[PDB]
Design an enzyme around this catalytic site. Structure first.
Site, PDB file in Angstrom:
ATOM      1  N   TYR A   1      -8.740   5.257  -2.764  1.00 46.98           N
ATOM      2  CA  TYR A   1      -9.243   4.071  -2.081  1.00 46.98           C
ATOM      3  C   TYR A   1     -10.769   3.999  -2.118  1.00 46.98           C
ATOM      4  CZ  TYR A   1      -8.423   0.129   1.035  1.00 46.98           C
ATOM      5  OH  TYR A   1      -8.313  -1.135   1.571  1.00 46.98           O
TER       6      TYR A   1
ATOM      7  N   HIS B   1       0.831  -1.207   0.000  1.00 44.55           N
ATOM      8  CA  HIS B   1       0.000   0.000   0.000  1.00 44.55           C
ATOM      9  C   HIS B   1       0.865   1.255   0.000  1.00 44.55           C
ATOM     10  CE1 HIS B   1      -4.095  -1.352   0.097  1.00 44.55           C
ATOM     11  NE2 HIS B   1      -3.885  -2.147   1.128  1.00 44.55           N
TER      12      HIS B   1
ATOM     13  N   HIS C   1     -12.393  -4.392  -1.220  1.00 49.10           N
ATOM     14  CA  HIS C   1     -11.916  -5.729  -0.876  1.00 49.10           C
ATOM     15  C   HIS C   1     -12.746  -6.843  -1.512  1.00 49.10           C
ATOM     16  CE1 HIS C   1     -10.396  -3.265   2.583  1.00 49.10           C
ATOM     17  NE2 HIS C   1      -9.301  -3.948   2.306  1.00 49.10           N
TER      18      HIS C   1
ATOM     19  N   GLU D   1      -6.339  -2.513  -3.901  1.00 45.90           N
ATOM     20  CA  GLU D   1      -6.374  -3.730  -3.079  1.00 45.90           C
ATOM     21  C   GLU D   1      -5.736  -4.916  -3.787  1.00 45.90           C
ATOM     22  OE1 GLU D   1      -7.037  -5.054  -0.053  1.00 45.90           O
ATOM     23  OE2 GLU D   1      -6.705  -2.931   0.374  1.00 45.90           O
TER      24      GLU D   1
ATOM     25  N   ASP E   1     -17.784  -1.040   2.194  1.00 49.06           N
ATOM     26  CA  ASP E   1     -16.380  -1.359   1.952  1.00 49.06           C
ATOM     27  C   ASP E   1     -15.796  -0.400   0.912  1.00 49.06           C
ATOM     28  OD1 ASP E   1     -13.922  -2.860   2.061  1.00 49.06           O
ATOM     29  OD2 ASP E   1     -14.584  -4.041   0.333  1.00 49.06           O
TER      30      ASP E   1
END
Ligand code: LYS
Ligand code: ILE
Ligand code: CA
Ligand code: CA
Ligand code: CA
Ligand code: CA
Ligand code: CA
Ligand code: ZN
EC number: 3.4.24.27
Length: 316
Positions: free
Chosen positions: A157, A146, A231, A166, A226
């Site tokens: 993000y 990251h 993810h 991710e 999320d």
């Protein structure tokens, strides 16, 4: 701290013994002076204030159960630094040997790990869902990747650019796991997830749908949880990367594999030269095609396999 570089010994979260680079000045500190401007591991002492105190030890031996997450965070950060330097000629996460900092024993029963923009942070887990998260080399390399993304492409993000963010961290997490050659696989977090249950993991790259994650663009998550599924939708890109490396037939589309080393070279070039903060999945396809073209030729098998893999997961 200023002092003498030395080498200690300890036991990690899984009970394996290993040597770690420490620094001696009255105490022995978890400070590795052999890699760039240093790897530093801190004790957050079950609080959320960061970074905590630089890990200090009286005798340079790290066999207490309380030591184990510090041992692995420190050691696996070094392995990840070595991967980026030896394989991609990159000096730490910023390319100019920035110091790598990690805090362990973050909070109480904290079932996660993260890069917070300046450092890595590892919970201990609650002992059922997770054991201490630094025990997983793919977890550590995921978090540290990251930092690499933040200093290069800068993928935001959320939504597709977050899913790419991710996936990059899962891909390089896995490649680091293969580089260290300790029970490598295409699963994420298997060494620290659910100690009561064998054979499972947090996510799978070889078969994302095993745990409910999409393996095709038509199954992408379009809601708001999320951060817009960063993810979840990463499973589409993870499957594509698995196919590029290993080959396979996926929704009727056959992909000739080109192996892990070339997968790494293509995605590293895509990340550091072509991706931008708002890149979407379609832009990732073009970046990977161009990267493979740069490295191997527009008519190479490598370019062909990249195209086949993204067709297989439905990314045009
Ligand atoms: N790291 C991922 C998955 C782990 C979840 C741990 N409870 C996340 O924060 O969503
Ligand atoms: C890479 C696994 C860990 C839990 C990460 N913070 C999520 O995903
Ligand atoms: Ca070492
Ligand atoms: Ca000791
Ligand atoms: Ca493994
Ligand atoms: Ca793994
Ligand atoms: Ca398990
Ligand atoms: Zn992540």
């Amino acid at each position: 701290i200023t002092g003498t570089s030395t080498v200690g010994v300890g036991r990690g979260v899984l009970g394996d013994q290993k040597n770690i680079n420490t620094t001696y000045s009255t105490y022995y500190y978890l400070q590795d002076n052999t890699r760039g401007n240093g790897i530093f591991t801190y004790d957050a002492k079950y609080r959320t204030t960061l970074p905590g105190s630089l890990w200090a030890d009286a005798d340079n031996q790290f066999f207490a159960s309380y030591d184990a997450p510090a041992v692995d965070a420190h050691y696996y950060a070094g392995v990840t630094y070595d991967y980026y330097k030896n394989v991609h000629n990159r000096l730490s996460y910023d390319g100019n040997n920035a110091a790598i900092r990690s805090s362990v024993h973050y909070s109480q029963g904290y079932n996660n790990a993260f890069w917070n923009g300046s450092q890595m942070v590892y919970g201990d887990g609650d002992g059922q869902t997770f054991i201490p998260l630094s025990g997983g080399i793919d977890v550590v390399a995921h978090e540290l990747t990251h930092a690499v993304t933040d200093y290069t492409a800068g993928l935001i993000y959320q939504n597709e650019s977050g899913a790419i963010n991710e996936a990059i961290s899962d891909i390089f997490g896995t490649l680091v796991e293969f580089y260290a050659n300790k029970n490598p696989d295409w699963e994420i977090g298997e060494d620290v997830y659910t100690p009561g249950i064998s054979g499972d993991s947090l996510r799978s790259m070889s078969d994302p749908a095993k745990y409910g994650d999409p393996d095709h663009y038509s199954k992408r998550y379009t809601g708001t949880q999320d951060n817009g599924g960063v993810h979840i939708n990463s499973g589409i890109i993870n499957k594509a990367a698995y196919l590029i490396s290993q080959g396979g037939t996926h929704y009727g589309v056959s992909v000739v594999g080109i192996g892990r080393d070339k997968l790494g070279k293509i995605f590293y070039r895509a990340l550091t030269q072509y991706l931008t903060p708002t890149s979407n999945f379609s832009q990732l396809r073009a970046a990977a095609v161009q990267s493979a073209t740069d490295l191997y030729g527009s008519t190479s098998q490598e370019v062909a396999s990249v195209k086949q893999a993204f067709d297989a997961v439905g990314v045009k």
